[PDB]
Design a protein around this ligand. Structure first.
Ligand SMILES: [Cl-]
Ligand SMILES: [Fe+3]
Ligand code: NA
Length: 444
């Protein structure tokens, strides 16, 4: 599995020494550099390959400016590097339509943004070397702003990889050591497993010794009834059957809003499939390859539900509490080394065959609940009891408690940092594409 490109595991706040944080910060930054350096021509940075996201030049500068802005806010920095750039690159976008984004969106030169990145790197490195790391770090400690910036950089490694995937292959260059998972051919039978009901506690305590975003915190007990879930995420080969049974052409599997999305975008298959010469090819990060039939299918929420509609019989997606019960049970002390047991943290540079990582079966019997691809949940993004916005970033999650965003959990092959662990709560508009799939659920 992928070894040459290595991502350092997250660190407990009780062990966030200066030396360990230097290593984690250096690793977070060098990883993003490797991804951004995969674009061959500078002119490509002014394309926005995802029509619902900013041009690539924005994301080249956004991670660096985020660090600077948060460090200034806690007064660990007395001035920025470029106040215009810190405004321009301050916050991203989350539009419902490409027309909204186009109306909203003069960009600087690529070389100028790279120079800003390099200056910002040296400025943060000097802050780290000149600040006392009095253990333990915590949410009211000034260094929380640094913990925030590193996790924000690592999330944008994930979200930018999806933008580069939407560029033509001729515009990107695979980094040395990038390795896709193998494919074993057709997948095994995807059996439904009974998950025994139980009570779960959602949320994270304020004094938990791990960095977290504001929406992670709170406390909610939820009694979860028993339910059936497929042992594997739905595979490309399973979704091919859906296509061959006219899944995209039957309104009864969709609803008015999702059908409208499909029609307006002329969708006939998942985004990274392409039909040519009788067969589907598949677009990995940098190459088009024969469709890996045993990999989890990558779809948006509309497509996942349309598949559930074709299955019928009340087939549905899990709730947040059901996923937590299946993944972590009713008990919990996080063990960071367990990240190595799943397709997380660049173990592979792609999704893997369901069940290939033999250490990736949860105690519930379900495979790749953690890792491989994010999995969609029928759960509107919402706060847990006790939620409180952090003063450093009050708009992080509160604007998205709008019943217009569905959640996803578990992490993907590209996921790094604290986002690979138990408490991270992820959310997207249901039409949006991520490294995300789904499994199916029935009550009986
Ligand atoms: Cl764990
Ligand atoms: Fe951001
Ligand atoms: Na998963």
């Amino acid at each position: 599995h992928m070894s040459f490109i290595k991502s350092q595991l997250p660190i407990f706040l009780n062990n966030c020494t200066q030396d360990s944080v230097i290593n984690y910060f250096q690793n977070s930054w060098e990883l993003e550099n490797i991804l951004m350096r995969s674009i061959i021509d500078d002119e490509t940075f002014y394309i926005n390959p995802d029509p619902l996201r900013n041009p690539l030049i924005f994301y080249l500068g956004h991670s660096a400016a985020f660090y600077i802005n948060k460090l200034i806010r806690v007064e660990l920095l007395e001035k920025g590097i470029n106040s215009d750039y810190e405004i321009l690159f301050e916050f991203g976008v989350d539009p419902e339509n490409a027309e909204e984004l186009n109306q909203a969106i003069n960009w600087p030169d690529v070389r100028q943004v790279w120079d800003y990145r390099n200056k910002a790197y040296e400025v943060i490195l000097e802050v780290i070397k000149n600040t006392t790391f009095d253990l333990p770090i915590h949410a009211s400690h000034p260094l929380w702003a640094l913990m925030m910036g590193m996790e924000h950089q690592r999330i944008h490694f994930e979200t930018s990889s999806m933008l580069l995937r939407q560029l033509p292959t001729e515009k990107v260059e695979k980094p040395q050591g990038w390795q896709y998972a193998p494919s074993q051919g057709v997948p095994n039978t995807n059996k439904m497993i009974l998950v025994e009901g139980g009570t779960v506690t959602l949320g994270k305590a304020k004094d938990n010794p791990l960095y977290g975003w504001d929406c992670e915190y709170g406390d909610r007990l939820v009694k979860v009834d028993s339910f059936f879930a497929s042992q594997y995420l739905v595979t490309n080969g399973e979704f091919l059957e859906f296509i061959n049974r006219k899944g995209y052409e039957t309104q009864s599997y969709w609803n008015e809003k999702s059908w409208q999305w499909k029609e307006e975008n002329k969708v006939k298959n998942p985004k990274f499939w392409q039909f040519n010469n009788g067969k589907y090819s598949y677009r990995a990060m940098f190459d088009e390859i024969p469709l890996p039939l045993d990999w989890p299918v990558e779809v948006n929420y509309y497509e996942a539900m349309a598949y559930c509609g074709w299955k019928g019989k009340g087939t549905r997606l899990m709730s947040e509490a059901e996923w937590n019960l299946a993944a972590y049970g009713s008990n919990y002390q996080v063990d960071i080394e367990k990240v190595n047991d799943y397709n997380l943290n660049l173990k592979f540079g792609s999704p893997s065959p369901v069940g290939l990582v033999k250490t990736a079966q949860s105690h519930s019997g379900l495979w790749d609940l953690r890792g491989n691809v994010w999995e969609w949940l029928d759960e509107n993004f919402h706060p847990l009891p006790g939620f409180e916005p952090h003063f450093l970033y009050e708009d992080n999650s509160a604007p998205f408690f709008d019943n217009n965003h569905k959640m996803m959990l578990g992490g993907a092959w590209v996921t790094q940092g604290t986002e690979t662990l138990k408490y991270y709560r992820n959310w997207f508009r249901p039409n949006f594409y991520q490294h995300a799939g789904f499994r199916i659920v029935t009550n009986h």
